[PDB]
Each structure stands twice: as structure tokens, then as C-alpha cells.
Amino acid sequence: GSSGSSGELALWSPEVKIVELVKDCKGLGFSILDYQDPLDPTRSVIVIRSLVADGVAERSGGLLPGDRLVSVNEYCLDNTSLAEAVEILKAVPPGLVHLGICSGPSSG
Predict the structure, then answer these.
(1) What are the DSSP calls for 57-95, one per residue?
(2) Angle at 105 between CA 66 and CA 3, to 5 degrees
(3) Domain boundaries, the chain
(4) Distant-in-sequence, close-in-space partners of 27: CB < 8 Å, separation ≥ 6
(5) Domain 1-108, CATH 2.40.30.60 — does that match?
């Protein structure tokens, strides 16, 4: 059982956190983008672009800019294309929003 040294994805945590976000008419208050692993270029992940000023994201106090988003309202956003990710957040119904997050390189 020789674990990998200076390799295993550390940028994020192996434990995702479900943040309860209350969507509104306009929708959410955050953004997302497509990322590419520095070791695996053939692999992409969705990150938290940024939290709109006083946006649902910030309000709740669970999301942060730089964290890797797992899913939104039970939606596998793994290796998903930005376009797809955005559409998923737009197609998602209003109200409570159960989305996971992977603590990443935060400057806070």
C-alpha cells in the first residue's frame, strides 16, 4: 500500500460538501467555468467562477470562488462541458438547491 507521493489530486478534498442554496426567479448568484487537470489534460472539471455580490451563493455562505463543483440538484457535472454545466444550472428548478462542492485553493 504505497500511496502516491506529490501526485494524488490534493488541490481539492476527497470529501464533498452539500451546500443548501435557495434559488430565485433569476436563478442562482454564482458562475462556473471549465477546468483542466495539470496532470490529466483529457480530464476537465467545473469550478466556481465567482459568487455574485450578495448572491444566493454568498448569502448561504458555503460556496467559494475556486472550489470544484461536484453536482447541482443531483446532476453529475463530472467531466461536463461548460455549455452543459451552464444549461444544467439554468434547467434546474427553483427553491432549495442541493449542490456539492470540493474545497479548493482559496485565498480567504
Answers:
(1) HHHHT---TTPEEEEESS-B-TT--HHHHHHHHHHSPSE
(2) 125
(3) 1-108
(4) 89, 90, 92, 94
(5) no
